[PDB]
């Protein structure tokens, strides 16, 4: 399938170090080696986890077309990936050359895969880096050539892609042009929460072109959510459709195609998470504190990028006038791989989960913004931009000072915060993949 | 129908001199006549055209509960009205009183209400003010009582509506409640475009509750459209559907409803301008000059509040990196009746009109923004939030400071323009409604 490619990912920071690793300057060969977890959902996906930097005084001969490789630092390799038996990637530049492996590169694979394979009984590969940081990689199977990296990325402020060659164009396209189309048609997207916002960002993800769609959620069309929920129709309402369905089925007309993965469940299950492990893109648009924690884990533990959106219009009773509307506002919270996080900014805390639980538990024993379809579309038109905007910079200004917007309508400001304001925590959850307990939630194991 | 109630809608500028006549300060009677025209489409429309003060001097008497009314006004009244039949509203005030006829009022009127039409074969009317502005009005056929006016409306920088008395409670709705759609279930919306930001601004009327939609376009969904206009499928693609008849069902699916009314045909025609005039508010979301003015000049025409959106991506190619986006920007404007017109604020201009004709001459005769839903959704969610805000303001500024916005999504500025810093011209054709040829265009006589 064009959404059943593999995945080669790297954090911003680790490709960074292995960037300024693999060009000192002198115009010769340096290598470095990756060694990486695998999510194998539908999608092979290897996850980089540690770097060994291959020290330049190491390597017997250094030129600007050849670098040996040290046989230990295979042997470190080996060492690190044995436990969890992890994938081991070589890494070497290609310091004014092009990304093509040579026929030296060919040879040394061939030699250097059946080592680390018979050191680790895994999927192990190869791959180079000109300059500018783009890379190339191929795959190993029991220590032989089983196929190339269809693609290479790297999720930072800016978002790269770094596509397999094909014998056709394939040049980074602009925002809001067909190229783009080009780019979402092989990627994945994750829509948690099919709701007031989530339908109108489901809905643009979709015209957009993105080749597979994930949809998650439980919830049901009801009465109440027709003023709200973009294709939804009073049939829909009366026999309570699932959010889910109603959306794929709506995608399938819409495309002409059933490219939707409609999961009828909450982002909080085994089924949910696993499979948004396979997505490019995760979009959280449901209103808890429990779930924004769950798809800021599965970002953290799959390295992928996650955008945050949500809504507010707190009322208040005023003594003379009744009633009124305190504020109406937006936010939108992207979330790169190794950067701060939805619990850095504060968005959940532990406090505010166990309150919601308790609360909800109330409810259950016991059993203000009810037509808001235009905050909905602006927060929802934001959010979907600021992916376009990440993947296809147009802004006159980085990226990274976008990291968390703010808006308020009635206040009629808009505010921003930089990524760099933003203190970070110890991730311990980065590049884990899919170890138990899943997300490090019990709840969640196996 | 919900969708058939009559009307009386005054000017911003007409009704702040009439509150003035009227409530002088020695909480005594006042009295003024409003002189109207008429437009009698699926509902009748009167115009206030021409207003008559009464001066207090020349009431015989004047109390805190009666004003007599001297009979040479009515017949200034009449003389007024006589050439083009329009219809007289006798209008006095209640200081210290309540928005209710009296007996004295209804034996009065049956008196006066004959000598109007003795004078002038027409509908003719009176009417009651309280000292903050609001209104109830009633008409009379044939000189003899007919029915109350349903809606009496000012639509100013905030827009008013005043509904005649009903034993159901009827207090004016918070912004984003359900109060909200019991106020839009009586109104009659009309979607110039059926557009990349037109199928979302007809979105979002359809779902917040609106009675009536109309929807003008002689476009048809093609391929090319499937990336922007909600509802739209590649099944009506295959088939080259019209937009109109395309929204039309896909609001009668949501809706549970048939409230649309599809005019398959451009805004530049008898057919559309006729529908239009009905409307109780104006959305233009069609990228052409012509289109632009056509709406301009209805709205001025039929006072009836505009709402102009429009977005554009410029493009220039950088001599090292090739085409670029120049700027990705969004324009509202919000226009009241005898306040400042989009050919004020050089919207459009004649030579613009003149220029875009010819091009399309000479592009028939021969024969960059491709992808941009969410640009569309960022406008057209701000458009109809527009009309929000003026109908239950909301925002912490008054809504005249949001004549005009607009925004840049690559420059992160967002900018408004208050109506009192727009020049005016001369309107002309301010409350002259259907007068031929209709809107002084010739193409459009009869
Ligand atoms: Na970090
Ligand atoms: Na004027
Ligand atoms: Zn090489
Ligand atoms: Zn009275």
């Given at each position: 399938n064009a959404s059943s490619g593999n995945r080669l990912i790297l954090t911003q920071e680790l490709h960074t170090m292995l960037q300024k690793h693999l060009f000192p300057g002198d115009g010769k060969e340096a290598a470095a080696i990756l060694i990486c977890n695998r999510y194998e959902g539908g999608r092979l996906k290897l996850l980089a986890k540690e770097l060994i930097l291959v020290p330049y005084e190491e390597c017997k001969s250094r030129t600007s077309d050849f670098?040996?490789?040290?046989?230990?630092?295979?042997?470190?390799?080996?060492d690190v990936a044995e436990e969890k038996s992890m994938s081991i990637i070589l890494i070497h530049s290609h310091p004014g050359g092009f990304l093509v492996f040579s026929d030296t590169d060919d040879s040394s694979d061939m030699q250097t895969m059946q080592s680390l394979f018979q050191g680790v009984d895994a999927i192990h590969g190869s791959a180079i880096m000109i300059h500018s940081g783009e890379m190339?990689?191929?795959?190993?199977?029991?220590?032989?050539?089983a196929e190339n990296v269809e693609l290479v990325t790297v999720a930072g402020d800016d978002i790269h892609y770094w596509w397999d060659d094909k014998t056709e164009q394939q040049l980074k396209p602009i925002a809001f042009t067909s190229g783009m189309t080009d780019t979402f048609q092989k990627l994945t997207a994750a829509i948690i929460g099919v709701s007031g916002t989530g339908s109108i960002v489901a809905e643009q993800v979709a015209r957009l072109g993105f080749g597979e769609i994930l949809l998650i959620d439980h919830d049901h069309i009801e009465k109440k959510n027709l003023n709200r929920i973009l294709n939804s129709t009073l049939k829909d309402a009366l026999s309570h459709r699932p959010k889910v369905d109603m959306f794929a089925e709506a995608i399938r007309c819409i495309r002409g195609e059933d490219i939707s993965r409609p999961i009828n469940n909450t982002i909080f299950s085994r089924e949910a998470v696993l499979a948004a492990?396979?997505?490019?893109?995760?979009?959280?648009?449901?209103?808890?504190?429990?779930?924004?924690?769950?798809?800021d884990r599965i970002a953290s533990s799959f390295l992928?990028?996650?955008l945050d959106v949500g809504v507010k219009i707190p009322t208040h009773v005023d003594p003379d006038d009744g009633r009124k509307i305190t504020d109406v506002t937006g936010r939108i919270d992207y979330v790169k791989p190794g950067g701060s996080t939805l619990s850095d900014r504060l968005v959940y805390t532990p406090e505010l989960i166990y309150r919601e639980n308790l609360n909800a538990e109330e409810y259950e024993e016991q059993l203000e913004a009810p037509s808001v379809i235009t905050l909905n579309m602006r927060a929802a038109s934001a959010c979907v931009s600021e992916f376009i905007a990440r993947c296809f910079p147009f802004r006159e200004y980085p990226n990274k000072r976008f990291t968390r917007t703010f808006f308020s309508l009635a206040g009629v400001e808009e505010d921003y915060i930089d990524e760099s304001?933003?203190?970070?925590?110890?991730?311990?959850?980065?590049?884990?993949?899919?170890?138990?307990?899943?997300?490090?939630?019990?709840?969640?194991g196996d």
């Open positions: 670098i040996a490789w040290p046989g230990n630092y295979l042997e470190k390799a080996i190339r990689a191929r795959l190993y199977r029991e220590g032989k050539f492990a396979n997505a490019d893109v995760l979009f959280c648009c449901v209103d808890t504190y429990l779930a924004r924690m769950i798809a992928i990028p996650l304001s933003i203190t970070q925590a110890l991730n311990t959850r980065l590049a884990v993949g899919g170890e138990e307990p899943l997300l490090g939630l019990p709840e969640l």
